Design an enzyme around this catalytic site. Sequence first.
Site, PDB file in Angstrom:
ATOM      1  N   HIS B  41       0.811  -1.211   0.000  1.00  0.00           N
ATOM      2  CA  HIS B  41       0.000   0.000   0.000  1.00  0.00           C
ATOM      3  C   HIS B  41       0.854   1.274   0.000  1.00  0.00           C
ATOM      4  CE1 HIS B  41       0.372   1.075   4.286  1.00  0.00           C
ATOM      5  NE2 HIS B  41      -0.183  -0.093   4.684  1.00  0.00           N
ATOM      6  N   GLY B 143       3.008   6.097  10.087  1.00  0.00           N
ATOM      7  CA  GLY B 143       4.415   5.922   9.765  1.00  0.00           C
ATOM      8  C   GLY B 143       4.993   4.609  10.293  1.00  0.00           C
ATOM      9  N   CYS B 145       3.731   1.563   9.677  1.00  0.00           N
ATOM     10  CA  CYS B 145       3.535   0.486   8.717  1.00  0.00           C
ATOM     11  C   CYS B 145       4.868  -0.082   8.245  1.00  0.00           C
ATOM     12  CB  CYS B 145       2.698   0.931   7.528  1.00  0.00           C
ATOM     13  SG  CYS B 145       0.971   1.235   7.955  1.00  0.00           S
TER      14      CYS B 145
END
Lengths: 300, 305
Positions: B41, B143, B145
């Site tokens: 993503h 942030g 991820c």
Amino acid sequence: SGFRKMAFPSGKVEGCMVQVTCGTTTLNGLWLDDVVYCPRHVICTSEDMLNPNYEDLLIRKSNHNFLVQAGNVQLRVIGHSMQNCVLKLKVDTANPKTPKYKFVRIQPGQTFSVLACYNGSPSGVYQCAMRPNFTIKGSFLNGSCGSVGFNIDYDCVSFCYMHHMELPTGVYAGTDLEGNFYGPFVDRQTAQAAGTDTTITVNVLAWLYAAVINGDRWFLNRFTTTLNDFNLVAMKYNYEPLTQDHVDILGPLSAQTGIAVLDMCASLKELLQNGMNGRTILGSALLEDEFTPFDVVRQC
Amino acid sequence: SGFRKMAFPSGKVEGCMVQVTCGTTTLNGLWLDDVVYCPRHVICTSEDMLNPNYEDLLIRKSNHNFLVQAGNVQLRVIGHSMQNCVLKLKVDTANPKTPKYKFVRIQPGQTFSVLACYNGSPSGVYQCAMRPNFTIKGSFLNGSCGSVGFNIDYDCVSFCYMHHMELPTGVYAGTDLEGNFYGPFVDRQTAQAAGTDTTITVNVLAWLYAAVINGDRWFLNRFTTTLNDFNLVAMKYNYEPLTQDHVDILGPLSAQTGIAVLDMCASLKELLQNGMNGRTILGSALLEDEFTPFDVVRQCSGVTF
């Protein structure tokens, strides 16, 4: 939404852990530059620990009696001395993995990470606080002595704790990296009283702000209080008295949430007087005091 | 005299964390050999996330759209591809700090450490469990991820989790390192139901054994139960049914303490039915289920890596 107790990444400290053996006793040391730091009780037998004369015991030791191993590398000990309750072993090689570092003596109520080690090897990492009674609520088995506590600020490791003792009451005590104990404790196997274990009020308040920020707001009430009124209640429940310095430290969290510090104090007062009635806050069934205001800001 | 939620030492994993930026999205990547692994993503705009066609989106991306930084050193991306929900960026340098590692898919109820990172920089470490409903109760801000979960056996890092999603309900979902989600979740910004969660019974029992080993024994009774009778009570309280496999796993802790597993089950039954009445166990006011039997043995025996 999500709030957890977090330790600092341990990699910079892992690179500094060594094994120190003197006779039959093995524990952990901290290797920075060309010095290895460890608890002086490495020189003691089980019997010596009951009433040790550290000066006399050390005078019977020579450089070659200290076996210091960094992974598979044997270090060569070229000098030794005692500073308070810590031994400093000078080795002939500087640790190539020495990080930028400081030694700090932390204040009661401040938090730090521990890298628990056995035989010079890392076992795990967890976050602790220096309790107001100068004990630490950890997990330190036989052989964990010389494990250290630390904070990291960017690339600088601030070492604040070295583990020495388990008291007969099951609580833990140790020193700063100059070898001075936190609290009244000594490195002797004797009965030692820790004082009353007070709750770190400013930290509980910080965590209540964290709860609000994360949407857990049931405990907010319609009351306010004064410092003096609140402190009468704090004293009754073995909470630390709150000062203006504490109020000031909470200012950014007050700003973020729109909740004045004394208003949050009144919510805490009601929780103390009435209990939590089986309810949870941030998934806890009791009031958490081992997050500092800075810890909450960092994570939130 | 002490028992703590303990994470693995993170040093081996710290050396593998990098920053990946694609357009306006920056998150974390895992650099092993000459491959950086990150959530696919990263290639999405805020708008794309509502209903992404990842195949189409990836086709429109070029190598030069992916900025990868290991500390202050920019790595050069020389290829990209997708494996399930993970993006693999080929870089022109092998990570010299690549540890011995495996990719493993863990079971619900198992635990692991997370190295929470922001913009490729390690921030902290904490110990988590994979919930029975395949969510994580963690702390993953914007942030975070691409942060990974892992276990360590001796010298081998077993990566088991990569963080992808915060669901609207504030719980967290992610994948194994082959990019397959744990649970029913998808990498789309949409309403997604997590199943009913349950309490991990075998882990609660393990933690009660930890309490006894550490000198906290108030909750021990001289009552008995059967597995079937215990499970009738477990079901009522949204506890996982206990199986003979679970009884077997607890056997070493039973042996250490002299407390038969079904005897500890009888103690747990009473705690469920009667509550804890304001008392604590190992300093907790509720029953802790994020320690496995292996976790208790490890901490109580001082295993190192």
